[PDB]
């Protein structure tokens, strides 16, 4: 599923990302735009042989199992395919774990390059929520 901007803003708010670890809703919407273009089925292969899955591009080395990532530790991690659902619940749960890992949203390089410190409220501006 490809979300509209205001549609995703509403679902991320319903899924408790607004002010999760202090990060306002617009950071999360901005992060999805530059990571996945609001597409829950986005996949991108890295040089290292890992893959990033879904609306927030969760990495297969650390957080999900895709069966082909060299050096992945925990084979019982949630299948990376479950992070591609029209329902964002599983992706939101992984993102909350990642953002609590010690680096905040700096874990998302696209957020850091394009969203951090900018007018992120613009990504929820015009939205009913």
């Amino acid at each position, epitope marked *: 599923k490809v979300f509209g901007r205001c549609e995703l803003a509403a679902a991320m708010k319903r899924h408790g990302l607004d002010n999760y670890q202090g990060y306002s809703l617009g950071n999360w919407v901005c992060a999805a735009k530059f990571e996945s273009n609001f597409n829950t089925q986005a996949t991108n292969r890295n040089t290292d042989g890992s893959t990033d899955y879904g609306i927030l591009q969760i990495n297969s080395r650390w957080w999900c199992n895709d069966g082909r990532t060299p050096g992945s530790e925990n084979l019982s991690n949630i299948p990376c395919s479950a992070l591609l659902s029209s329902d964002i619940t599983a992706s939101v749960n992984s993102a909350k774990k990642i953002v609590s*890992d010690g680096n905040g949203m700096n874990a998302w390089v696209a957020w850091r390059n394009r969203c951090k410190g900018t007018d992120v409220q613009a990504w929820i501006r015009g939205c009913r929520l």
Partner: antibody
Framework: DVQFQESGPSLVKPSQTLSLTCSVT????????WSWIRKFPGNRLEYMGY???????FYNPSLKSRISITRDTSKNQYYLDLNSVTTEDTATYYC???????WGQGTLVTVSA | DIVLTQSPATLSVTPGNSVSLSCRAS??????LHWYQQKSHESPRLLIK???QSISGIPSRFSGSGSGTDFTLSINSVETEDFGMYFC?????????FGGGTKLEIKR
């Protein structure tokens, strides 16, 4: 199968250091943060701290900088050190995952002379 | 630090009846509210995560709802084995914090 198990002294003198070990075992282990939680005799629960999957520590500011968490990923072990204890530190200490799925049995620790 | 208020601290209930346990947060915490059952001689048992999400192995009679500052744990057809302490815990903000607990006493 995932099991968290605490061990270490059940008795600590006032002003000394409370030290506990957690051993994480099973064939079902997932990438998670590793936490310490305690339960005071009056049923109050306090989230003491955790060490992230990446090894970054988080400490409850209430513990007034007396707390240290370290880990040894080669042993699937992690450690709590709590300095300068008082009778206020008598509690049931649990190791648990950050997801809350898996908690240890709990070890009663008494601070007393 | 976020304060969770579980009121009342004690509730007596007749088996087969329904019960709602309140957890109010001092600031909005979205859905970032988890429910624990604790019996003496045992570790806390996670019942509900993120306000409403089902946990595998937890009987269907357990459900949660709410968001922002107002959360409820519901038990439909309270059974005798449902005696014990019920704790809410927030994960929106470090330090994570727990409510005071609600003790469930079974009537007979």
């Amino acid at each position: 199968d995932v099991q968290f198990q605490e061990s270490g002294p059940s008795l600590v003198k006032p002003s000394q250091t409370l030290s506990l070990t957690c051993s994480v075992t099973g064939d079902s282990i997932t990438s998670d943060h590793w936490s310490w939680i305690r339960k005071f005799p009056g049923n109050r629960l306090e989230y003491m701290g955790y060490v992230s999957y990446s090894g970054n520590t988080f400490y409850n500011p209430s513990l007034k900088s007396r707390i240290s968490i370290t880990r040894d990923t080669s042993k699937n072990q992690y450690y709590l050190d709590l300095n300068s204890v008082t009778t206020e530190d008598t509690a049931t200490y649990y190791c648990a995952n950050w997801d809350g799925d898996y908690w240890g049995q709990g070890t009663l620790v008494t601070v007393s002379a | 630090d976020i304060v969770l208020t579980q009121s009342p601290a004690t509730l007596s209930v007749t088996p087969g009846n329904s019960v709602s346990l309140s957890c109010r947060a001092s600031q909005s915490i979205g859905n970032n509210l988890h429910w624990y059952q604790q019996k003496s001689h045992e570790s806390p048992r996670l019942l509900i995560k993120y306000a409403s999400q089902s946990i595998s192995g937890i009987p269907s009679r357990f459900s949660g709802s709410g968001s922002g500052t107002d959360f409820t744990l519901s038990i439909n057809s309270v059974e005798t084995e449902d005696f014990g302490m019920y704790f809410c815990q927030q994960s929106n903000s470090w330090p994570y914090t727990f409510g005071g607990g609600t003790k469930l006493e079974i009537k007979r």
